[PDB]
Amino acid sequence: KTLSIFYQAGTSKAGNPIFYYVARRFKTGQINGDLLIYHVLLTLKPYYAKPYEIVVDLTHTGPSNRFKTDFLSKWFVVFPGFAYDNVSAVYIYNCNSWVREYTKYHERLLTGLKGSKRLVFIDCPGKLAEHIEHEQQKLPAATLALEEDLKVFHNALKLAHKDTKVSIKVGSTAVQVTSAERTKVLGQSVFLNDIYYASEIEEICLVDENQFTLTIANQGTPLTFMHQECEAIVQSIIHIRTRWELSQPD
């Protein structure tokens, strides 16, 4: 009941089959990891003897999608040794701050991935397609969705102890806070894209005429941003939140 988490789709421009891991699709608790390590073992077996590439859609991956240390460990010890080696490339799409922080929390186990040239962090579906068969990227429909009909606010500033220059992209279904400055994730300076589904925007608050707060469900401390067009960001987010509430279950 988890053939959607890890599916095969496409071939790379280097001539290797592509396998997608939708991190958000997997849930720690419920979809027993025993079940996913199973399915990944099974769709890879026929392939991991020869070289293959992986695309991990870290899109909106959060703590509920995590690999607990015991599980995460089992992943670096449960495959034929060549199997790890034949992974020609692992495109990491939509890495966000939680996965990064997860990546730091589990640096003990992800030590091998640090600096690994094989991990290519990708910014958009278009940059991932370049490494694929005539740009036929099969990122989930859901993922690709987040890329269209976006109201983008550049030069925004996420306020925190460390201020992060970000662009706040408001899409009909989610707000994405794409960092404009790179930060390290597994030793590679990459852009982070934090996605906040309208369903998760509990409160939007305009602090100043150029600063707003975004309370995201279950993330406690609201996010804070500074931007010249704040009134407009807030209004766009409220709209998206409202259009969402209208279609809420009874």
Ligand X SMILES: CCCCCCCCCCCCCCCCCC(=O)O[C@H](COC(=O)CCCCCCCCCCCCCCC)COP(=O)(O)OCCN
Member of 56, 168, 198, 223 binding ligand X (CB under 6 A): 56
Starting at the earlier edge strand, list the strands of the sheet with 193-197.
Answer: 193-197, 174-179, 164-171, 150-158, 223-226, 211-216, 201-208
- Residues pairing with 172 in the sheet: none
The binder of 38, among ligand X, its own copies, none, by C-beta within 5 to 8 A per type, is: none
Rounded least distance, CB 232 to ligand X, Å: 34
Please report, as residue ranges, which positions from 61 to 90 form the binding site for its own copies (by CB under 8 A): 62, 64-65
Report the DSSP beta bridge partners of residue 121: 92
Q: Closest by alpha carbon to 157, among 77, 224, 248, 206?
A: 224
Nearer to ligand X, 72 or 145 (CB): 72
Task: Count CA atoms closer than 13 A to 211's CA, side-chain side.
Answer: 9
Could you tell me if 132 and 8 are in contact, meaning their C-beta atoms sit under 8 angstroms apart?
no
102: helix, coil or strand? helix
Q: Out of 2, 173, 183, 211, point to the residue binding its own copies (CB under 8 A).
A: 173
Instruction: Provide the mask over 128-157, with x wherever binding to ligand X is found by CB under 6 A and - wherever it is not.
Output: ------------------------------
Q: Which residue has the tokens 């550049």?
A: 154
Contact 57, 22 (CB under 8 A): yes
Mask of contacts with its own copies, 230-249, x by CB under 8 A? ------------x--xxxxx
What the block records as the tokens of 39 is 């399915």
Q: Pick the binder of its own copies from 78, 83, 145, 206 (CB under 8 A).
A: 145
Stretch that binds ligand X, among 70-78, 141-149, 204-212, 233-241 (CB under 6 A): 70-78
Binding site partner of 153, from ligand X, its own copies, none, Cβ cut-off 5-8 A by kind? none
Q: Is 99 in the site for ligand X (CB under 6 A)?
A: yes
- Contact between 39 and its own copies by CB under 8 A: the answer reads no
Query: Which secondary-structure segment (H or E) carries 229?
Result: none
Site for ligand X in 11-40 (CB under 6 A): 21, 23, 40
